[PDB]
Structure formats: C-alpha cells, structure tokens
Design a protein around this nucleic acid. Sequence first.
RNA 1: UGGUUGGCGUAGCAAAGAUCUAACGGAACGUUGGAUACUGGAGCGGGGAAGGAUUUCGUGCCAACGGCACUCGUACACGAGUUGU
RNA 2: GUUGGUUUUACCCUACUUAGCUGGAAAUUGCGAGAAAAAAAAAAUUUUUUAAAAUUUUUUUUUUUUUUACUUGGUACGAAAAAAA
RNA 3: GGUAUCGUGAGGGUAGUACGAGGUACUCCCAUGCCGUGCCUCUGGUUUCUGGAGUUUGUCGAACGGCAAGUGCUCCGACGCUAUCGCACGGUGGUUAGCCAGUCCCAAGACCAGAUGCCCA
RNA 4: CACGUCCCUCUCCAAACGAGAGAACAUGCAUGGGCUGGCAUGAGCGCGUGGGGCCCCGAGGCGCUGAACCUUGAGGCCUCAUGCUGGGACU
Lengths: 397, 152, 150, 127, 61
Amino acid sequence: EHPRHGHLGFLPRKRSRQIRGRVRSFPKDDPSQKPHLTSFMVFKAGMTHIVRDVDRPGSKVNKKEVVEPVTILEAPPMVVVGIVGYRQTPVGHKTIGTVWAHHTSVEFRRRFYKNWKQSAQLAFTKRKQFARTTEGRLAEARTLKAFAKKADIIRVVAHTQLRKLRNNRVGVKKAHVSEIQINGGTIAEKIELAKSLLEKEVRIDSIFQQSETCDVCAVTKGHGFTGVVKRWGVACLPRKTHRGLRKVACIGAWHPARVMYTVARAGQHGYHHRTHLNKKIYQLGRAVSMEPNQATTTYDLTAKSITPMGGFVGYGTVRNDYIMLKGSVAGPRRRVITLRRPMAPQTSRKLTEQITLKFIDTSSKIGHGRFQTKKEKSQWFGPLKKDRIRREERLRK
Amino acid sequence: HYSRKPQVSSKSAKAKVSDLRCHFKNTFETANVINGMPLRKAQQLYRQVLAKTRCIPFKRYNGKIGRTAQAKEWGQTKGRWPRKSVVAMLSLLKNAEANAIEKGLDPNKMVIKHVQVDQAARMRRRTYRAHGRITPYMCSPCHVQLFMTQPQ
Amino acid sequence: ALLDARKKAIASRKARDDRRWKRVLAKMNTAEHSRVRGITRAALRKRTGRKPDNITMEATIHLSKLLKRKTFHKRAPIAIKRIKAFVARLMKTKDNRIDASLNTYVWHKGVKGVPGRVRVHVERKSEKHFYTVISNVPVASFKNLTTKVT
Amino acid sequence: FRVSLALPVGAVVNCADNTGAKNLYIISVKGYHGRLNRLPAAALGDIVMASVKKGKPELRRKVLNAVIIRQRKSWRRKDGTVIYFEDNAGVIVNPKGEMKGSGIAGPVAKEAADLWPKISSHAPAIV
Amino acid sequence: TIDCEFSHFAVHPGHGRRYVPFAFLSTKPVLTFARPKCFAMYMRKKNPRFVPWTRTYRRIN
RNA sequence: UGGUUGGCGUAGCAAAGAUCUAACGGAACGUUGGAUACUGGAGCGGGGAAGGAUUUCGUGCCAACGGCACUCGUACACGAGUUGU
RNA sequence: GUUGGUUUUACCCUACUUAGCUGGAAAUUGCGAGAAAAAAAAAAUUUUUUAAAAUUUUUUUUUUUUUUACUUGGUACGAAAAAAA
RNA sequence: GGUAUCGUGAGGGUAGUACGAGGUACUCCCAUGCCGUGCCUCUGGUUUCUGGAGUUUGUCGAACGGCAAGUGCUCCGACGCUAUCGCACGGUGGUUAGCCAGUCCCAAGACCAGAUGCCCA
RNA sequence: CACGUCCCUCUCCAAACGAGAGAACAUGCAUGGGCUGGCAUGAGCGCGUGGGGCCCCGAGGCGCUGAACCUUGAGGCCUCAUGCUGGGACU
Ligand SMILES: [Mg+2]
Ligand SMILES: [Mg+2]
Ligand SMILES: [Mg+2]
Ligand SMILES: [Mg+2]
Ligand SMILES: [Mg+2]
Ligand SMILES: [Mg+2]
Ligand SMILES: [Mg+2]
Ligand SMILES: [Mg+2]
Ligand SMILES: [Mg+2]
Ligand SMILES: [Mg+2]
Ligand SMILES: [Mg+2]
C-alpha cells in the first residue's frame, strides 16, 4: 500500500468553462482597511530568473544571492466600466443591480459579440442614451441607493484593455471583462471608491505592491485527452504487460461492483482552473515607454528591458506595465490570468520579506542566450559581414 | 408507386430511382434533409454538402458516427458528408426538374413535398473471415422516390 | 448596394474620430504620434478591386515552414497540395495547374527532399472558368525577393 | 539544501578516502523515508550504509557507513549554479560521522563539507 | 558573470553548469561551461584555440 | 428450413516503403509525355514441370464480379489464336 | 521430486472517465396563476421637485461633430449646433 | 422570446503530511522527504527545425548540389514537450484528533424572478 | 424579418472529433528585412606529404569567411517593408 495518486478535490478534471481565470472567492472584507480593489487581470508573458540576496535568519543562504525564476505578466491597466452590488439572502448573494459607466471602450463592447465588425454594434446603445437622460440618471441614482442600503458586496466590473496590450499574439480584441471586488470600509466608502473609479483606468501598482503576494487564478495549460499515466501519475506497467503498459491495471473490484469515482481514468488533463497561492511580487513594472530601464537594478546598472533579446517566445515584447512574480504561473504564455489579493494570512516570515532584486535576467529565451543585451552581443561579435555589407551601402548613398 | 400522392397532379413533378446502388443508411439521411426544402435550396444543400461546406445531418442512422460542427445547422452534433448519396440525390432532383419542366411547371418555384428512401432488395457478396468462415457482405441499395409540387 | 454605402459611413466612423484625434496630437520622446513613424490612426487595411482577371503573380513560397515535421515520404505530394492551396488564396481559383517546371522542382530532391522555398510564377487565365498555371521561377537565391503581382 | 538524488541503492561509488577501501557499494541511505517502489538514493552529503566491494579484505564484507562527497549527478545550488563531478565517490565514516580515513582524495563537495565538520577539514578542496 | 572554461562565453548567474573534474586545478576546481557544446568540446579535449567561435580563437586572430 | 433483424454505417478494409504532373480520354479511372521512386539477377525479371484449361489476343464492355473506384480487368460479350521429317 | 508445456473476445449494457448537444417549472400538458420582489419618486417618514398653454409649440439639455487627465492613437469632459423630449 | 455577458452557489468533491535541525521545555524559526497543484527561466532528457556540420557505401559523367541506405550513420542543435533530473506554491474558522464550514475543485436537473447588454417582425 | 448566432474562411492560449479561444479589412495572411538563436566557417576562386616535366598533380591548410545556411513552421520576436485581399444557414 502507498498513498493515492492524485488530489480528489481537483475533480472532475474537466476543461474549465472559462479561460479568463475568474476569482472564485475574494479575500474576506475588512472594514478597518481603506477601500481597495482585490484583483487584477494580467497576461502571462514568459519566465526569466533573477538574482536576489536572501536575508532570512536561518538557512544556509542568508546574505547569499539566489536565482529565483520569475514569471513576467504584462498588465495593461484595467478599466472600470460598472459597479455591482450584492445583497445577502438566505439563499445566497443576489446582484442588486449594476451601474454601467457612461461610456464604454469598444474593446469592452467587443466582448458582447462573436462578430463585432459585422454586427450592428448596438451594445450599450440604449444605456448610453438613457444614462444621459435625467430619467435614467435618477434610475442610476436609485441603484446606488440600493447599494448603500441593501448591499454587502460592491464590485467593479473591470476589463482588460487589449488595445493597449498591443501584443501581436494575444489575438483577442474582445475585452476581458470581470467583476473585481472592493474590499475596504463601509459600503458607502466602497460605493465611493467604486464610482470615482467608475470609468478610470486601474494600474496594478495601485492594487498590488512589491514583495506582497498574490493568489493567481488562471486555467492551466491544456493537454487534451491525456492518458492516466500523465493525468494521475500512476505507474506504468512492466514491459511484459500485454494489453498495454500505460494503464491502471485494476480499475475496480468485485464490490462495489462498478468503477468508483476515485480510480484514475484517461481524459482531459490541463486547462483546469487553479487558484495558486502566495506568489511574491518581485516587481511591479511601469510601461517601457514611461520607464525604459526596466530590469536595471541597483546592482546591475545597464539600461535594459524586462523582455528578453528575442522577445518572449510566443509573446514578444512587454510593452506595458508588468507584474513580475516569483515562480511559475499556471497557464500558457499570453493567457489572461486573474490575480487577487492574498487570501492567506500573509504574516509568514517569508511572505513578508522585502525583495530587492540584484539582477533581472534578459538573455534570450531561444537558444541559450549568453548575452543580456543586444548592445552587449554586438559588443562581443563587434562588426560583422551584415554590417560591412550595410556600412558600404551607406557610404555609396 | 408513391407512398403519398401529390396534392395536385398538374402542379407537381415526380421522380424516382429504384435499386439505387448507394447505401440505404446514407441515402436515408441525405434525402430526408430535403423533404421540406424548396428544390433550389435542395440543389444547393447538396452542392454545398458535396464540397464539405455543410453536412448531411445523420439522424436515425447515426451509430458511432463522428461529431462535426457543420451539424449545428441541423440541431445535432452528428453529421456526415455522403458523396455517392449526395450525387445520386442531385441526379434524382435533376430527374424531377426535368419532369417538372415538361409539365410546364417552373422548377425554381417547385418544392420537395415527399422524399422516401425505402430499402431495396439486397445484393449478396462474401467475406472470408478468420478460421475458415465466410460471412456475408451485402450492399443495401435504396429505393428513393419523391415528388415536388410548386405552390399555387 | 446599401452595404457599400454603409461601409463608406463606416470608413467615416474612423475618419470622424481619426480626423479629430490628429489635431489634438499635433497640439500636444519615443511616444506614438501621427508623424512619428505607419499612420497611427488609420487601420492596417486603410492603405488599399477587380484586378484584371488575367495576371501573373510571382511570389516566394516558403515551403519548409509548410512541411515541417511532415512524414518524409509524403513531403513532395503535399508540397504540391500546399503550393496549390497557397496559390488558390491569391488567384481565388478552384482550378490551379502545376506545370512540369514546378512539379519537377518540388520533386527533384525526391519525396522528402523538397526544397525549402520556391519562387512560383503563377498566372490566372480567362476562359474552372478562371484557371491558374503555377510555373517555377528558378533562382540563385530567395533573399530579398518579394511577391511581384503583375 | 536540495541535492538531486544521485546514488540509488545498488550503486557503487568510489572510495575517495585514505583507507584501503577501493569502492563503496551503497546498501541503503540513512534517513530514507520510503515511498513504495522507490529505491533509496544517496546524494551528496548523505550518510550511506555501504559495503566495500573491492579493497582491503578487512573492510570487505561488513556493512559500513559512508558520506557521499562527490556526485556525477548534477544538482542545482540555491545560488542557481547547477554543478557536478567527474566521479561520485564517498568516504568511509562512523555512525557518528567521524571519518575513518586520514585524508580525502579528490575535491569534496560544498554540502559534503558543510554537513561533516571532519570531512571538510581533510578535504583537499571544497566545491 | 563567470566566463566559460572553453569558449570563454560570458556565463550569467542562471546559466550554464559547473563541472568539477577529479583532476582539479586547485586554482580552478570548478570549470564553468556556458553550453553543452562547450563541454563536449572539452571532453574531446579540443583546445579552444582551434574552434573559431570561441574567444581564444578570435583573440589570436 | 426460408426470410428478416439489433449490434452497425459499426469492427474494420493499418504486413511489403509512392506517387506527382500536364495533356487527352470519358457521362465522370485509364493512355501518353515528364517527374519520382521501387523491384534489385534466389527480382512484383525471362522460360518450363505439376496444376489450371481459354485465363491467351483483339475489339467492346463494365449490369454483376475485381471487399474503395474504374473509363481499366484474369470479369462480361463477340470474334480470333496454338502450324514441326 | 524433476524438466518442457497455446492465457482467446468488448465493437453490447452499465459503472466510470473526459467530451458535446437539446429539451424542461402541471418537470414537455392547463389557460393549474405561489418571487427569499416591490408593495410619484428621491433625498434628507416627510417634503420638495419634476412641460405648459390653449395636441402643438417652445425651450432646455444632451450628444455629436468639427476645429487638461487619463498608458501616450482614442475615448472623456471643453464649443457650438442640432435634435429630441 | 431570442442572443449575449457578468455573477449566485444549493449540492457534490476536498489534502496536505512527515521528519530534522535551530532557538528556548511550548512558542518561534530553518531545511528536507513524501504528497499535491502547477510551470519550463535555468539544468537535464527528447529532435522529423532530417536545422547546421561531418561522414560511409551506392548514384547523379565530374566539381557543386544532391540523392538512396524505410531518419544511413556521428556531432552540435532551437521551438516544444518534459524531470522531484529543474522550478514555484500548498490559507483558515466553528464545534466535539475527529467533525462541520471555508479557502480549493465541479457547480441551476438547485431549472437562479440574480443582475445586465441588445433586438423583441 | 430584426438583433444576433452559426457554418464556410483565417488564427491558436484549444483540440480525438464536437467544444474552446479569437479574427472578421485586422500587420490578417503572405513573402522580404531586421532581430534572437542555431550550426560552424559555404561556393568560389586565390602553406603543403611528396610527385611529374618554372610551373603543373596534391589530402590537408590558409584568405576573403563568426562565414554559408537555417531561424515559426503544431503556429520565435519587431510594423520593420512591401504584397494580397465576405457567402451561406438559422430565427
Ligand atoms: Mg504477453
Ligand atoms: Mg528557451
Ligand atoms: Mg469509432
Ligand atoms: Mg465516431
Ligand atoms: Mg482456408
Ligand atoms: Mg470505422
Ligand atoms: Mg532499389
Ligand atoms: Mg486479356
Ligand atoms: Mg469469360
Ligand atoms: Mg410549460
Ligand atoms: Mg501563421
């Protein structure tokens, strides 16, 4: 006898019914806090590693640089476009209603369509003309009265700005809409944060901050109808085995006289929703145009960019704000991953640690990439024939 | 003859192909799609299904037939693209627009009103199975018959 | 023709917002501007039919991307199916024709030895009503070549 | 820290040690909590029950202890520096961990030398 | 940035793997290699001098 | 004993590497050219015994048969054909 | 005691494992009517404000088009004019 | 009534575990093992990018370029996949370790008079 | 018939097939370039075992030459540059 192969609380292992990785539960509201947003949609870019000086009493690495992998997650600001209130009921939370923003970016209204550009594009057209009228202004006014009254939960309906993402590979132009809960103070305080913020952008740096952790939720990378050996980790059978090796030899017994829900079976692996915890935020990163010397740490002064030399493979440059957080993040490159405020206690000696990066890595992913910089590669090879066949042309002109 | 007499002999064209040597089950599927359709949209469905642009919704004679996305049109997941059966159907619909034309009727107002692929007497052939056995192979040719009134 | 007229209003949908935005950007270091680098406001396809239904395009077909990890002894036959699929997109023809010049080239290194690229000399012809004849365009090097419709 | 397991039971690592043992045959790894089919596996710094398979007969047929001081199976430092050896040899040692040799042959690993205060001293080098 | 034992490529903190030969140099017990190509090229005991992409090659030329 | 059935348009038709092209044909696979491979002389070569006995050949045909298809066939029909001191 | 000694079939049903589709609240019907809804409206239970004057006309407000603050191409408020309530 | 979007969450699943060292004999630390959930920056493995090179016999009259050897063979080899062979992570509350709730996973045949967008010939 | 959905078509974070995600004139696709990598110095002409009668034959070597080629394709990057640009079903 050995332990069971696989966690039964991650089950059924079925395809997620979404891809945007929506938060399942927001961290519990704390009135003592000032109001804030609790999550932020971001696009996985790729990974690198960083050097860091761990300064953790105990261990053999205190005061010693350690190479942590990091995931880079491009994070163009989300736009709030509507508030949502929930009222508690004996049967469970009910939306009171939502107040949509007076205006909606097309990328958002793209979301209500399968073919926006061959549509009449009438989405939020009556709201636009009605929220304008005093009749619809008083109606919007009444919804907020209902929030301030009957609500227990205020939530912004934010979305991603894919227009601003300018990624060439994330093909979506429908915005990634999602309610983002406002934990904070009294419901009027949450309404007020909610409505002042009701058509504004929301950068991650406001929601998060460095060294703080974030729970991540994104659908994990899809593997199709995976077999039982890859899906559950069961031992494959000895070579001599007949019908085939890669099987659970015994999927049941005489009784109960049927396969139980607990025996492992071939089927969908990957592309499951996951909430992974306590991912330290090694740096929030401002957009490359605004703060070009990303990845230029105090100890590595060369002006530099968070994106590797070949760009991120399959993704390309991170043109925007980026969250850089320790370790792996579930989901393939360029998937949209919601990442919430931590729901764990976060009073751990580790979790509270400030993270001063000593060296973001920027070598090519693609090959081994022994250069941190496109300038430095040229500084190795120096001029070569592509230039001499270039330099000569310039002289002739 | 025809299972159902046309409502108005002068206004309808009949067509038929006995002992059609296409599978009954595929032709059963292929002709039933057409049963209410206007002849031009039925000429069309076949020209399109002959291009793998649309599918014939297999319905009764599904079996462990494969899922397609072109079957959404028909309300179900299974669908299929007979070619031998789609061509015989066009070739029987040519037969009726010809029959419809001679009656002075206009083929492009004409509507399919009755399609009925009966299964025909079957042709024997032989397997040669494992340990010295000889099980049957049998084609299942269909009798397809139809008529198409034009509205008055 | 309401859609053609409606599409012209749809072109104005951008030109209305686009015209207003250009003036504001002119009023206000590597930041994107209308004159910075191409035109920021216009869509990618704003730059652009019934071309004479009789032309002779000449374009490189990068086969190797189109045959990567294909079964080796199926490479040539599908190099040829793909050169037709490649060219059917341009000529919009259901009736492409691969002349001996191009069949031999796809094949001259045998089934699996299919050349990395090919400079086809496709030509639509009037008369399967429109048909294309896909010739080879032998060349010492594919570098710096580009599709040249004529 | 973590050192990717290198020398499963049944392995014959060399004796780097001064002693007349020529090579060790790992028998089991001390501190090995076992999963079912998994073979116990010594890695760098690990104490190991080992019988000398070749060398002075006096050592030859009893189970002995031996820490692993180098390892062909490469491992990753927390420093992010994956590293490995030409060979993977251990040294004979007491259950206490005092080494019975008088001087180790080749280089000793950094995390051999840090777990074993005596091994570190006799080590010609640390790596 | 240690530089490779063979090609003398710059080898940054996350990259390459070290290798400790039994026949250590004392001075250089651990021999960094940027790449498997550099290590195999060393197991052949090729001198870096004749392999053109290495720096020791380019330096003499 | 005959017929019919569900399973089921399913299980399969996955051994021996392979076809591609144009032109023509045709109501729509063959034919030719080219290309490409294969057999690889203990051959998918050229002749014989046994055995088969018209399968030969031409024209036509393709209803049935050639487990897909055939415009083609060892199939079908018709006409031919085997020469000795 | 010794030695040598064919391990066949799921393509059915259910279980299960993933994967889809579609109905359905008199669980497909009845029209057989039950809401964890509210019981002139909104803002600070009561008070004040929101078309008017003789169906049409006039006035006011809001939105769209043209000529600073937001991540920085594209949307907001600026203005002015037109349309709708 | 369509279509679409955001959610609700009854119900069901459910997981973390162990060892050691430190520190002072609880707290508090710090590593590891196992388990589990991922991920692929690095490192290893994997090559049908038959990528690039080398190379053997046959072959293309030869060089070049190939080609055949069912991927000829050897070297290096990106993408990708993957390894406790790399790496990240594994949270609470309430009741009597259990147990229940939560977090976590599926979640309206739990038919959600929840919200919402659009059109309602 | 509206809104719209779907198919066909294109893309892939999806994928046995359905489903999914997206696109829907869009740097969308296509080539090309630049880059990031890979390999490792192409073709071609211009020191050397000896050999043949100052040249010729000569493996190898040198020089141009980190060259040549390959680099997104089951789907690296860059807008950098040019090229090419709806029908059907349903209610
Ligand atoms: Mg067996
Ligand atoms: Mg990489
Ligand atoms: Mg099947
Ligand atoms: Mg099927
Ligand atoms: Mg027999
Ligand atoms: Mg089958
Ligand atoms: Mg041969
Ligand atoms: Mg004959
Ligand atoms: Mg006969
Ligand atoms: Mg009803
Ligand atoms: Mg592409």
